[PDB]
Coordinates of C-alpha atoms in Angstrom, one line a residue:
Chain A
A27 CA -45.2 4.4 32.2
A28 CA -43.1 6.8 30.0
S29 CA -39.9 6.0 31.9
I30 CA -39.6 2.9 29.6
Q31 CA -38.7 5.5 27.0
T32 CA -36.5 7.3 29.5
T33 CA -34.6 4.0 29.8
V34 CA -34.3 3.1 26.1
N35 CA -32.9 6.6 25.6
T36 CA -30.4 6.2 28.4
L37 CA -29.4 2.9 26.8
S38 CA -29.1 4.3 23.3
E39 CA -26.8 7.1 24.5
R40 CA -24.8 4.8 26.8
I41 CA -24.3 2.4 23.9
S42 CA -23.5 5.0 21.3
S43 CA -21.1 6.5 23.9
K44 CA -19.2 3.4 25.0
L45 CA -18.7 2.3 21.4
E46 CA -17.1 5.6 20.8
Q47 CA -14.8 5.2 23.8
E48 CA -14.3 1.4 24.2
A49 CA -13.9 0.8 20.5
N50 CA -13.1 4.0 18.6
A51 CA -16.5 4.0 16.9
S52 CA -17.7 7.2 15.2
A53 CA -20.6 8.6 13.1
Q54 CA -18.1 8.8 10.2
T55 CA -16.3 5.5 10.3
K56 CA -16.6 2.9 7.5
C57 CA -19.3 0.3 8.0
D58 CA -18.7 -3.3 6.9
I59 CA -22.4 -4.2 7.6
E60 CA -25.2 -1.8 6.8
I61 CA -28.8 -2.1 7.9
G62 CA -31.3 -2.7 5.2
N63 CA -34.9 -3.0 6.2
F64 CA -35.6 -2.4 9.9
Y65 CA -39.1 -3.1 11.0
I66 CA -41.5 -4.7 13.4
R67 CA -44.0 -7.5 12.7
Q68 CA -46.7 -6.4 15.1
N69 CA -46.0 -2.6 15.3
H70 CA -48.5 -1.0 17.6
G71 CA -46.9 2.4 17.9
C72 CA -43.1 2.3 17.7
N73 CA -41.2 4.7 15.4
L74 CA -37.9 3.3 14.2
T75 CA -34.6 4.9 13.2
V76 CA -31.2 3.5 12.4
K77 CA -27.9 5.1 13.5
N78 CA -24.4 4.4 12.4
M79 CA -21.6 4.0 15.0
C80 CA -19.3 1.7 13.1
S81 CA -15.8 0.6 14.0
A82 CA -13.7 -2.4 12.9
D83 CA -13.2 -4.3 16.3
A84 CA -16.3 -6.5 16.7
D85 CA -15.2 -7.7 20.1
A86 CA -14.5 -4.3 21.5
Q87 CA -18.0 -3.5 20.2
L88 CA -19.7 -6.5 21.8
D89 CA -18.1 -5.6 25.1
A90 CA -19.2 -2.0 24.9
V91 CA -22.8 -3.0 24.2
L92 CA -23.1 -5.6 27.1
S93 CA -21.4 -3.0 29.3
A94 CA -24.0 -0.2 28.5
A95 CA -26.8 -2.7 28.9
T96 CA -25.5 -3.7 32.3
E97 CA -25.0 -0.1 33.4
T98 CA -28.5 0.8 32.3
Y99 CA -30.1 -2.2 34.0
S100 CA -28.2 -1.4 37.2
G101 CA -29.8 2.1 37.1
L102 CA -33.3 0.6 37.5
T103 CA -34.9 0.5 41.0
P104 CA -35.4 -2.9 42.8
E105 CA -39.1 -2.3 42.0
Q106 CA -38.4 -2.0 38.3
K107 CA -35.8 -4.7 38.0
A108 CA -38.4 -7.3 39.0
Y109 CA -40.2 -7.0 35.7
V110 CA -37.0 -7.9 33.7
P111 CA -36.9 -11.7 34.3
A112 CA -40.3 -11.9 32.7
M113 CA -39.2 -10.0 29.6
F114 CA -36.2 -12.2 29.3
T115 CA -38.1 -15.5 29.3
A116 CA -40.6 -13.8 26.9
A117 CA -38.1 -12.8 24.3
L118 CA -35.5 -15.5 24.7
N119 CA -36.7 -18.5 26.9
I120 CA -34.4 -18.3 29.9
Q121 CA -35.1 -18.3 33.6
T122 CA -33.3 -15.7 35.7
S123 CA -33.3 -14.1 39.2
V124 CA -33.1 -10.3 39.6
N125 CA -29.3 -10.9 40.0
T126 CA -28.4 -13.6 37.5
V127 CA -29.9 -11.5 34.8
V128 CA -26.8 -9.6 33.9
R129 CA -24.8 -12.8 33.8
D130 CA -27.5 -14.9 32.0
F131 CA -27.7 -12.2 29.3
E132 CA -23.9 -12.1 28.8
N133 CA -23.9 -15.9 28.3
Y134 CA -26.7 -15.8 25.8
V135 CA -25.0 -13.0 23.9
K136 CA -21.6 -14.5 23.9
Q137 CA -22.9 -17.8 22.6
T138 CA -25.3 -16.5 20.1
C139 CA -23.2 -13.7 18.7
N140 CA -20.2 -16.0 18.1
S141 CA -22.3 -18.6 16.4
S142 CA -21.0 -19.6 12.9
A143 CA -24.4 -18.5 11.7
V144 CA -23.6 -15.0 12.9
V145 CA -19.8 -14.5 12.6
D146 CA -19.8 -16.2 9.1
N147 CA -22.3 -13.8 7.7
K148 CA -20.6 -11.9 4.9
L149 CA -23.8 -10.4 3.7
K150 CA -23.3 -6.6 3.6
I151 CA -26.9 -5.3 3.9
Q152 CA -28.6 -6.9 6.8
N153 CA -32.3 -6.6 7.8
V154 CA -33.3 -6.1 11.4
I155 CA -36.7 -7.6 12.2
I156 CA -38.2 -7.6 15.7
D157 CA -41.7 -8.8 16.0
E158 CA -43.7 -6.9 18.6
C159 CA -43.7 -3.4 20.0
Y160 CA -46.2 -1.1 21.7
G161 CA -46.6 2.6 22.3
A162 CA -49.0 4.7 24.3
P163 CA -51.9 6.4 22.4
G164 CA -50.7 9.9 23.3
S165 CA -47.0 9.4 22.6
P166 CA -45.5 6.7 20.4
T167 CA -42.3 4.7 21.3
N168 CA -39.1 5.7 19.6
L169 CA -36.6 2.9 18.9
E170 CA -33.2 3.4 17.5
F171 CA -31.0 0.6 16.1
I172 CA -27.4 1.5 16.5
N173 CA -25.4 -0.1 13.7
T174 CA -22.1 -1.3 15.1
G175 CA -20.8 -2.2 11.7
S176 CA -20.4 -5.9 12.2
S177 CA -22.6 -9.0 12.1
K178 CA -21.3 -9.9 15.6
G179 CA -21.9 -6.3 16.9
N180 CA -25.5 -6.0 15.6
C181 CA -26.3 -9.4 17.0
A182 CA -25.9 -7.9 20.5
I183 CA -27.7 -4.8 19.6
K184 CA -30.6 -6.9 18.2
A185 CA -30.8 -9.1 21.3
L186 CA -31.0 -6.0 23.4
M187 CA -33.7 -4.6 21.2
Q188 CA -35.7 -7.8 21.4
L189 CA -35.8 -7.3 25.2
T190 CA -36.6 -3.6 25.1
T191 CA -39.7 -4.2 22.9
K192 CA -40.9 -6.8 25.3
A193 CA -41.0 -4.1 28.0
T194 CA -43.3 -1.9 26.0
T195 CA -46.0 -4.6 26.3
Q196 CA -46.3 -3.4 29.9
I197 CA -47.1 0.3 29.4
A198 CA -50.0 -0.3 27.0
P199 CA -52.9 -1.8 29.0
Chain B
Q26 CA 6.1 2.5 15.8
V27 CA 3.5 1.1 13.4
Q28 CA 5.1 -1.4 11.1
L29 CA 4.1 -3.8 8.3
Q30 CA 6.5 -6.5 7.3
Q31 CA 5.6 -8.2 4.0
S32 CA 7.1 -11.5 3.0
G33 CA 9.9 -11.9 0.5
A34 CA 9.8 -11.9 -3.3
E35 CA 8.3 -14.8 -5.2
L36 CA 8.7 -16.7 -8.4
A37 CA 5.9 -19.0 -9.5
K38 CA 5.2 -21.1 -12.6
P39 CA 2.2 -20.0 -14.8
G40 CA -1.0 -21.6 -13.6
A41 CA 0.4 -22.0 -10.1
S42 CA -0.6 -20.1 -6.9
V43 CA 1.4 -18.1 -4.3
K44 CA 0.6 -16.8 -0.8
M45 CA 2.1 -13.6 0.6
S46 CA 2.0 -12.3 4.2
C47 CA 2.1 -9.0 6.0
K48 CA 3.1 -9.0 9.7
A49 CA 1.7 -6.1 11.6
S50 CA 2.9 -4.6 14.8
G51 CA 2.9 -1.4 16.9
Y52 CA -0.9 -1.0 17.2
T53 CA -4.0 -3.1 18.1
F54 CA -4.2 -5.5 15.2
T55 CA -8.0 -5.7 15.5
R56 CA -8.6 -2.0 15.5
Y57 CA -8.0 -1.2 11.8
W58 CA -8.8 -2.6 8.3
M59 CA -6.1 -4.1 6.1
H60 CA -6.1 -3.3 2.3
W61 CA -4.1 -4.8 -0.6
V62 CA -2.9 -3.0 -3.7
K63 CA -1.4 -4.2 -7.0
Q64 CA 1.2 -2.4 -9.2
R65 CA 2.6 -3.8 -12.5
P66 CA 6.1 -2.6 -13.3
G67 CA 5.9 1.0 -14.6
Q68 CA 2.1 1.4 -14.0
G69 CA -0.3 2.8 -11.5
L70 CA -1.8 1.6 -8.3
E71 CA -4.8 -0.7 -8.3
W72 CA -7.1 -1.6 -5.4
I73 CA -7.6 -5.4 -4.9
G74 CA -9.6 -5.9 -1.7
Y75 CA -9.7 -5.4 2.0
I76 CA -10.2 -7.5 5.2
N77 CA -11.2 -6.8 8.7
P78 CA -8.6 -8.6 10.9
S79 CA -11.1 -8.8 13.7
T80 CA -14.0 -10.5 11.9
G81 CA -12.5 -11.9 8.8
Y82 CA -15.1 -9.9 6.7
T83 CA -13.8 -9.3 3.2
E84 CA -14.7 -7.4 0.0
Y85 CA -12.9 -7.5 -3.3
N86 CA -12.6 -5.6 -6.4
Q87 CA -14.9 -7.3 -8.9
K88 CA -11.8 -7.7 -11.2
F89 CA -9.9 -9.8 -8.6
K90 CA -12.9 -11.7 -7.1
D91 CA -11.6 -15.1 -8.4
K92 CA -7.9 -14.4 -8.2
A93 CA -7.2 -13.0 -4.7
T94 CA -8.2 -14.3 -1.2
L95 CA -7.6 -12.4 2.1
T96 CA -7.2 -14.1 5.5
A97 CA -6.0 -13.1 8.9
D98 CA -4.6 -14.7 12.0
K99 CA -5.3 -12.7 15.1
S100 CA -2.9 -14.8 17.2
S101 CA 0.0 -13.8 15.0
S102 CA -1.2 -10.4 13.9
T103 CA -0.5 -11.1 10.3
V104 CA -2.6 -10.9 7.1
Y105 CA -2.2 -13.2 4.2
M106 CA -3.1 -12.6 0.5
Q107 CA -3.3 -15.6 -1.8
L108 CA -3.2 -15.4 -5.6
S109 CA -4.3 -18.4 -7.8
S110 CA -4.1 -19.5 -11.4
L111 CA -1.2 -17.2 -12.1
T112 CA -0.3 -15.6 -15.4
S113 CA 2.2 -13.1 -16.7
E114 CA -0.5 -10.5 -16.0
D115 CA -0.1 -11.3 -12.3
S116 CA 3.5 -10.2 -12.2
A117 CA 3.6 -7.1 -10.1
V118 CA 4.4 -5.9 -6.6
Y119 CA 1.6 -6.2 -4.0
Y120 CA 1.2 -3.9 -1.0
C121 CA -0.7 -4.3 2.3
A122 CA -1.9 -1.0 4.0
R123 CA -3.4 -0.3 7.3
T124 CA -6.3 2.2 7.2
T125 CA -6.8 5.4 9.1
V126 CA -9.1 5.4 12.1
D127 CA -12.3 5.9 10.0
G128 CA -11.2 3.1 7.7
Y129 CA -11.4 5.0 4.4
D130 CA -7.8 5.9 3.7
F131 CA -4.5 4.0 3.8
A132 CA -2.2 5.4 6.5
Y133 CA 0.6 2.8 6.6
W134 CA 2.1 0.7 3.9
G135 CA 4.3 -2.4 3.7
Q136 CA 7.4 -2.5 1.6
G137 CA 5.6 -4.6 -1.0
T138 CA 6.1 -8.1 -2.3
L139 CA 7.2 -8.6 -5.9
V140 CA 5.8 -11.7 -7.6
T141 CA 7.2 -13.0 -10.9
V142 CA 5.2 -15.5 -12.9
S143 CA 7.5 -17.3 -15.3
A144 CA 8.3 -20.8 -16.5
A145 CA 12.0 -19.7 -16.5
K146 CA 14.3 -21.1 -13.9
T147 CA 16.1 -19.3 -11.1
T148 CA 19.8 -18.6 -11.7
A149 CA 22.4 -16.9 -9.6
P150 CA 24.1 -13.7 -10.8
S151 CA 27.8 -13.2 -11.2
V152 CA 29.3 -10.1 -9.6
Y153 CA 32.3 -8.6 -11.3
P154 CA 34.2 -5.5 -10.1
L155 CA 34.8 -2.5 -12.3
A156 CA 38.1 -0.7 -11.7
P157 CA 39.5 2.3 -13.7
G158 CA 41.6 2.0 -16.9
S159 CA 45.2 2.3 -15.8
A160 CA 46.4 5.9 -16.3
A161 CA 45.4 6.8 -12.7
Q162 CA 47.1 10.1 -13.5
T163 CA 43.8 11.8 -14.4
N164 CA 42.2 14.5 -12.1
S165 CA 40.6 14.5 -8.6
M166 CA 37.9 12.0 -7.5
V167 CA 37.2 8.7 -9.2
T168 CA 34.3 6.4 -10.2
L169 CA 34.1 2.7 -9.6
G170 CA 31.5 0.1 -10.5
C171 CA 30.1 -3.4 -9.9
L172 CA 28.4 -5.5 -12.6
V173 CA 25.8 -8.1 -11.7
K174 CA 25.2 -10.2 -14.8
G175 CA 22.8 -13.0 -15.6
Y176 CA 20.3 -13.7 -12.9
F177 CA 16.5 -14.4 -12.4
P178 CA 14.0 -13.4 -11.0
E179 CA 14.3 -9.6 -10.7
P180 CA 14.8 -9.0 -7.0
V181 CA 18.4 -8.1 -6.1
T182 CA 20.0 -5.6 -3.6
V183 CA 23.2 -3.7 -4.1
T184 CA 24.9 -1.6 -1.4
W185 CA 28.4 -0.1 -0.9
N186 CA 30.2 -1.0 2.3
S187 CA 27.0 -2.5 3.8
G188 CA 25.3 0.9 3.5
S189 CA 28.0 3.2 5.0
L190 CA 28.7 4.5 1.5
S191 CA 25.5 5.9 0.1
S192 CA 26.7 9.2 -1.4
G193 CA 27.4 9.5 -5.1
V194 CA 25.9 6.1 -5.9
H195 CA 23.8 5.1 -8.9
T196 CA 22.3 1.7 -9.2
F197 CA 21.0 1.2 -12.7
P198 CA 17.7 -0.7 -13.4
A199 CA 18.0 -4.3 -14.4
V200 CA 17.6 -4.9 -18.1
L201 CA 16.0 -8.2 -19.2
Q202 CA 17.7 -10.1 -22.1
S203 CA 17.2 -13.8 -23.0
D204 CA 15.5 -14.5 -19.6
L205 CA 18.5 -13.1 -17.7
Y206 CA 18.7 -9.8 -15.9
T207 CA 21.8 -7.6 -15.9
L208 CA 22.3 -4.8 -13.5
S209 CA 25.1 -2.4 -12.7
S210 CA 26.0 0.3 -10.1
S211 CA 28.4 3.2 -10.0
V212 CA 30.0 5.1 -7.1
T213 CA 32.2 8.2 -7.1
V214 CA 34.7 9.3 -4.4
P215 CA 37.7 11.6 -3.9
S216 CA 41.1 10.6 -5.4
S217 CA 42.5 10.4 -1.9
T218 CA 39.9 8.1 -0.6
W219 CA 40.8 5.3 -3.0
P220 CA 42.5 3.0 -3.3
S221 CA 43.4 4.2 0.2
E222 CA 39.9 3.3 1.6
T223 CA 38.4 -0.1 1.0
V224 CA 35.4 0.1 -1.2
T225 CA 33.4 -3.2 -1.3
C226 CA 30.3 -4.0 -3.3
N227 CA 27.7 -6.1 -1.3
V228 CA 25.2 -7.9 -3.6
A229 CA 22.3 -10.1 -2.6
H230 CA 19.9 -12.2 -4.7
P231 CA 17.6 -14.1 -2.3
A232 CA 15.9 -15.8 -5.2
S233 CA 18.9 -18.2 -5.3
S234 CA 20.4 -17.7 -1.8
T235 CA 23.1 -15.9 -3.6
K236 CA 24.9 -13.3 -1.3
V237 CA 28.3 -11.9 -2.2
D238 CA 30.6 -9.0 -1.4
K239 CA 33.3 -7.8 -3.9
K240 CA 36.2 -5.7 -2.9
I241 CA 37.3 -3.3 -5.6
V242 CA 41.0 -3.7 -6.1
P243 CA 42.9 -1.5 -8.7
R244 CA 44.4 -2.6 -12.1
Chain C
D24 CA -18.8 1.7 -12.7
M25 CA -16.5 4.2 -11.0
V26 CA -13.8 5.8 -13.1
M27 CA -11.0 8.1 -12.0
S28 CA -9.4 10.3 -14.6
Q29 CA -6.2 12.2 -13.7
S30 CA -4.7 14.9 -15.9
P31 CA -2.2 15.6 -17.2
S32 CA -0.4 12.3 -17.4
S33 CA 2.9 14.0 -16.6
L34 CA 4.3 17.5 -16.3
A35 CA 7.7 19.2 -16.1
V36 CA 8.3 22.2 -13.8
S37 CA 11.4 23.9 -12.3
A38 CA 12.1 24.2 -8.6
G39 CA 10.3 27.1 -7.0
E40 CA 7.5 27.1 -9.6
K41 CA 3.9 26.1 -8.9
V42 CA 1.9 23.2 -10.2
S43 CA -1.6 21.8 -10.3
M44 CA -3.1 18.5 -11.5
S45 CA -6.7 17.4 -11.9
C46 CA -8.6 14.3 -10.7
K47 CA -12.2 13.8 -12.0
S48 CA -14.6 11.1 -11.1
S49 CA -17.5 9.7 -13.1
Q50 CA -19.6 9.9 -9.9
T51 CA -19.9 12.4 -7.2
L52 CA -17.8 11.7 -4.1
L53 CA -19.7 14.2 -2.0
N54 CA -22.0 13.4 0.8
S55 CA -24.7 16.1 0.8
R56 CA -25.6 15.6 4.4
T57 CA -22.1 15.6 5.9
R58 CA -20.4 17.8 3.3
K59 CA -17.5 15.3 3.1
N60 CA -15.7 14.4 -0.1
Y61 CA -14.5 10.8 0.0
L62 CA -11.3 11.4 -2.0
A63 CA -7.6 11.3 -1.1
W64 CA -4.2 12.0 -2.7
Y65 CA -1.1 9.7 -2.6
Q66 CA 2.5 10.4 -3.4
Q67 CA 4.9 7.7 -4.6
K68 CA 8.5 8.6 -5.0
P69 CA 10.6 6.4 -7.3
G70 CA 11.4 3.0 -5.8
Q71 CA 9.2 3.6 -2.8
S72 CA 5.8 2.8 -1.2
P73 CA 2.9 5.1 -1.8
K74 CA 2.5 7.8 0.9
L75 CA -0.8 9.4 2.0
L76 CA -0.8 13.2 1.4
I77 CA -4.3 14.5 1.6
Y78 CA -7.5 12.9 2.8
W79 CA -11.1 14.1 2.8
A80 CA -10.6 16.2 -0.4
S81 CA -8.5 18.9 1.4
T82 CA -7.2 17.8 4.8
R83 CA -3.4 17.5 5.1
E84 CA -2.1 14.3 6.5
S85 CA 0.1 14.6 9.6
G86 CA 3.7 15.7 8.8
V87 CA 2.9 16.8 5.3
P88 CA 4.3 20.3 4.4
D89 CA 1.8 23.0 3.8
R90 CA 3.0 23.7 0.3
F91 CA 0.7 20.8 -0.8
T92 CA -3.0 21.7 -1.1
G93 CA -6.0 19.7 -1.7
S94 CA -9.1 21.3 -3.3
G95 CA -12.2 20.6 -5.2
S96 CA -15.6 19.0 -4.6
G97 CA -18.2 16.6 -6.0
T98 CA -16.3 15.3 -9.1
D99 CA -13.6 17.8 -9.8
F100 CA -10.6 17.9 -7.6
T101 CA -7.2 19.5 -7.8
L102 CA -3.9 18.9 -6.1
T103 CA -1.5 21.9 -5.9
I104 CA 2.1 22.2 -4.9
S105 CA 2.9 25.8 -4.1
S106 CA 6.6 25.7 -4.7
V107 CA 7.9 22.4 -5.9
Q108 CA 11.3 21.0 -4.8
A109 CA 13.5 18.3 -6.3
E110 CA 12.5 15.9 -3.6
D111 CA 8.9 16.3 -4.8
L112 CA 9.7 14.2 -7.9
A113 CA 7.1 11.5 -7.9
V114 CA 3.9 10.1 -9.3
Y115 CA 0.8 11.4 -7.7
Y116 CA -2.3 9.2 -7.5
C117 CA -5.8 10.3 -6.4
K118 CA -8.1 7.7 -4.9
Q119 CA -11.8 7.7 -4.1
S120 CA -13.2 5.9 -1.1
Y121 CA -16.9 6.7 -1.6
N122 CA -18.1 3.5 -3.4
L123 CA -15.4 1.0 -2.6
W124 CA -12.0 2.3 -3.7
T125 CA -10.4 3.5 -7.0
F126 CA -7.1 5.1 -8.0
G127 CA -6.5 7.4 -10.9
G128 CA -3.9 6.7 -13.6
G129 CA -1.6 9.2 -11.7
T130 CA 0.3 12.2 -12.8
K131 CA 4.1 11.8 -13.1
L132 CA 5.8 14.9 -11.8
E133 CA 9.2 15.6 -13.6
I134 CA 11.7 18.3 -12.7
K135 CA 13.0 20.8 -15.3
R136 CA 16.7 21.5 -14.8
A137 CA 19.7 23.2 -16.5
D138 CA 21.3 21.3 -19.4
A139 CA 24.3 19.3 -18.3
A140 CA 26.8 17.0 -20.0
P141 CA 27.6 13.5 -18.8
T142 CA 30.7 12.4 -16.9
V143 CA 31.9 9.4 -18.9
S144 CA 33.9 6.5 -17.5
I145 CA 35.1 3.4 -19.3
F146 CA 35.7 -0.1 -17.7
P147 CA 37.7 -3.0 -19.1
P148 CA 36.5 -6.6 -18.5
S149 CA 37.0 -8.0 -15.0
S150 CA 39.8 -10.4 -14.5
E151 CA 37.5 -13.0 -13.0
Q152 CA 34.9 -12.5 -15.7
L153 CA 37.6 -13.2 -18.3
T154 CA 38.8 -16.4 -16.6
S155 CA 35.1 -17.1 -16.4
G156 CA 35.1 -17.1 -20.2
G157 CA 33.6 -13.8 -21.2
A158 CA 34.2 -10.1 -21.5
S159 CA 32.0 -7.1 -20.8
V160 CA 33.0 -3.5 -21.3
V161 CA 31.0 -1.1 -19.2
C162 CA 30.7 2.6 -19.9
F163 CA 29.0 4.9 -17.4
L164 CA 27.5 8.3 -18.3
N165 CA 26.8 10.0 -15.1
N166 CA 24.7 13.1 -14.3
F167 CA 23.4 14.6 -17.5
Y168 CA 20.2 16.5 -18.7
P169 CA 18.1 16.2 -20.8
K170 CA 17.4 12.5 -20.6
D171 CA 18.4 11.9 -24.2
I172 CA 21.9 10.8 -25.1
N173 CA 23.5 8.7 -27.8
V174 CA 26.2 6.2 -26.8
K175 CA 28.2 4.6 -29.6
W176 CA 30.7 1.8 -29.4
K177 CA 33.9 1.4 -31.5
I178 CA 36.3 -1.5 -31.5
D179 CA 39.5 -0.4 -33.3
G180 CA 37.6 2.3 -35.1
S181 CA 34.8 0.0 -36.0
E182 CA 31.3 0.7 -34.7
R183 CA 29.7 -2.4 -33.1
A184 CA 25.9 -2.4 -33.0
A185 CA 24.8 -5.7 -31.6
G186 CA 25.7 -6.8 -28.1
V187 CA 24.9 -3.7 -26.0
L188 CA 22.4 -3.3 -23.2
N189 CA 21.6 0.2 -21.9
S190 CA 19.9 1.4 -18.8
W191 CA 18.8 4.8 -17.5
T192 CA 18.3 5.7 -13.9
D193 CA 15.4 7.6 -12.4
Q194 CA 16.0 11.4 -12.3
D195 CA 18.1 12.1 -9.2
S196 CA 16.0 13.3 -6.3
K197 CA 18.8 15.7 -5.4
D198 CA 20.1 17.4 -8.6
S199 CA 17.4 16.2 -10.9
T200 CA 19.8 14.7 -13.5
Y201 CA 20.0 11.4 -15.3
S202 CA 22.7 8.7 -15.6
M203 CA 23.0 5.8 -17.9
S204 CA 25.0 2.6 -18.1
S205 CA 26.0 1.0 -21.4
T206 CA 27.3 -2.5 -21.4
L207 CA 29.0 -4.2 -24.4
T208 CA 29.3 -7.9 -24.0
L209 CA 31.7 -10.2 -25.9
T210 CA 33.5 -13.6 -25.5
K211 CA 37.0 -13.6 -24.2
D212 CA 38.1 -14.6 -27.7
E213 CA 36.7 -11.7 -29.7
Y214 CA 37.8 -9.4 -26.8
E215 CA 41.4 -10.4 -27.2
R216 CA 41.2 -10.4 -31.0
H217 CA 40.9 -6.6 -30.9
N218 CA 42.8 -3.8 -29.1
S219 CA 41.0 -0.4 -28.9
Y220 CA 37.7 0.0 -27.2
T221 CA 35.7 3.2 -27.3
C222 CA 32.3 4.6 -26.2
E223 CA 31.2 7.8 -27.9
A224 CA 28.5 9.9 -26.2
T225 CA 26.5 12.4 -28.0
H226 CA 24.4 14.9 -26.0
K227 CA 22.8 18.2 -27.1
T228 CA 25.2 19.8 -24.7
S229 CA 27.8 19.5 -27.4
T230 CA 28.3 18.6 -31.1
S231 CA 31.6 17.1 -30.3
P232 CA 31.0 13.5 -28.9
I233 CA 32.7 12.7 -25.5
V234 CA 34.9 9.7 -25.8
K235 CA 36.8 7.4 -23.5
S236 CA 39.1 4.5 -24.7
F237 CA 41.6 2.0 -23.5
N238 CA 43.8 -0.8 -24.9
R239 CA 44.2 -4.3 -23.6
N240 CA 48.0 -3.8 -23.7
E241 CA 48.0 -1.2 -20.9
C242 CA 46.7 -3.1 -17.9

């Protein structure tokens, strides 16, 4: 239903919040990496916005993001959680029980986000491109990309987003 | 307290390279950006580039793009800056600075690292003591001296009684002449304090492991 | 690209008085949305590292006296010291942090003071410099103002021109005066083939030159 938005908003605030706490991020802190074009391939009703919450410590960031994501997921009801494993496999190719999720995610993140491909990126303006997202006819889905300020930080944010968008495929029949 | 220890002075041949360091401590190394700045003798500050200790991300002034290279070792909490293909134009003092929280301004600075690019060869200075004429029968107080002549490169330190004596002291700027610097220092004290008190001149010139102290005995 | 222009290049003012300097950029440093001006002010006292004074166009850095004031916006900024003090002697640099980073040429702040004559001191060659094979006669002119003096050497009444190396210090951050060191260098031979040594100082504080002499046959 429309709680999917309730959730993405909870996440967006919890993320924006922990970065500020666990990493001294702020709306007015220099940004190494800036977001360029942020769009979706198959956009069936998702309005996108980018927010800056930059800080210098990429690892403090990555930890805050995983943290928020874990807190948020832990807030879902047993009934809701059950749909997550499917999203996972759909957006990443990874089996997972309703428990091993949190862990499996962390592993995926840690690996991916530390890849040379990622950490070695010295390209200042980076484009975020998800590929599918849906929104109800009445109300569209609002997605916000929180720019951590680092290639490694945004890598986590992006992975999170890829999952989120795969959950919007469930609201729209 | 926050502190940035930059490596010692340096003398390199033209065309050579050199690699300075900045050891940081007193704050989370990975929480702030580290910038480098250049300053030729008698000229203004000049931004070179910056580096994010945590990710190794860097950005340089277009002007230095091919000259300077910033790196960082998280395990040692130190940042290195390396200059290549040196020229007389590279002779200057280089500073490392830790940014403020937002990462836009420089809150803390190092003491700087002077680099001299010359084909000339190191040479230890000679420290001679300067004592008054002879007719000591001339008023209250008295000024003494210490002449440091004929060294290279330019970094030398002069203190009186290892720092205890800092009042009424004037260290004159080194003056180059035939590839050899000459520097002098003067100190004033009360008639009674000398020769009664022992006024010694401590001089150091790391460029040639020269370190000497010179007591000032009367004529 | 970005260009910072400070003005004036230097200015003299007496203690107590007020001063203002300008910093102008070829690009606006203001962020319409946030209303923030990405520009700061740095102070660099002689022989020291640059210190952060004002950040964000007008915010005072922790521990900075309130007599320093940052103002301006967009592309025209001004730094103002309400009532300057001797210790404020330094070069002030303005730096933009909007599009990368850039420093201005800086404004050297000098201190106007009351005219004062120098305290001259003469120094005969060192015993070990002599055995060494040479002879340098040092003459110190301490604490004078203005900065312009005329030292003149005379050997047995004869003015020697070649063989001298002069050096002025940086205006004292306490009494705002200058001091100079004049060094006449000879070989032990010429030194002994003469008897009277004299340095003649000429400062606007008098039409009668201050002199100090000595003879080898006195020590």
